Amino acid sequence: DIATLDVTQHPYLPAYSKTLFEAKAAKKLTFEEIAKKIGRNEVATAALFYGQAKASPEDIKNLSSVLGIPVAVLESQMSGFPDRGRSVEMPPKEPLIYRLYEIVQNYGYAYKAVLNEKFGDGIMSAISFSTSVDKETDKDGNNWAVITLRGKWLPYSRF
Template sequence: MAKQDKYTRELATEEILLAKRDKGLTFDEIAEAIGRHPVWVASAIMGQATMNAEEVYALVKLLDLNPSITTVLQDFPMKGSLEDRIPVDPLLYRFHEILQVYGTTMKAVIQEKFGDGIMSAIDFTMDIDKEEDPAGDRVVVTMNGKFLPYKKW
């Protein structure tokens, strides 16, 4: 793919992922070079977070990207990358299925422990780990969000 002079978020993501693949780098390795958490870096690369100038220039240098890509990576993104329909990708569908099956349970337990409110997706971190298991490796997803109580007025 020829390097662009102007980028959309989608084109920037595509070029970054191709360069990541071509250089054989992981999100962990890119995150180390940028100085951020690997899940946050993956989110920024996928167009869901805004990089600052220092972060974006480290990415450009590491992946040997066209410097004109820096502008779009510093723009405020449109949050939410999935379409309105149920995801068909099997991995994404399983998260949808988890919410369908356990969503009301999660809500009930959270509200029993904290009261009437929500978990922030703004003041939020997430870790994704691999747990080795002889019966088959396990995916461990830890979401950590600030509790925000509903306000009475």
């Protein structure tokens, strides 16, 4: 049971999102398999499919191969640079993504306070950054999602 895309309900994504997701659906591939094939993490590979990351030339050749899309089709639809941020309309209505938003809402200042006392005045980068999703089962049989955010600490300049 694999993630698919229906652009009837999901506007403003790049044309290649449809192209990639349609080939993904035809071949019944998971993002884990595609990720492995392109040498990028699962989340980043899915982010790429939603228009939220940039395909290197190697990614383009690797996707063409595993998805069965001719390279020239990807080179022309996946050219230039990502125009990030249109995939999620805020505030999020999708329940799973809403919970992530809720976490920011209820822990924002808590995270800021802790980060500030650990690092000082600055931010955790969302650019010089990686993230991953893991699945875990505990001893009682409960399942847990573990999302890790790892971003570079950037102090505010002094000028």
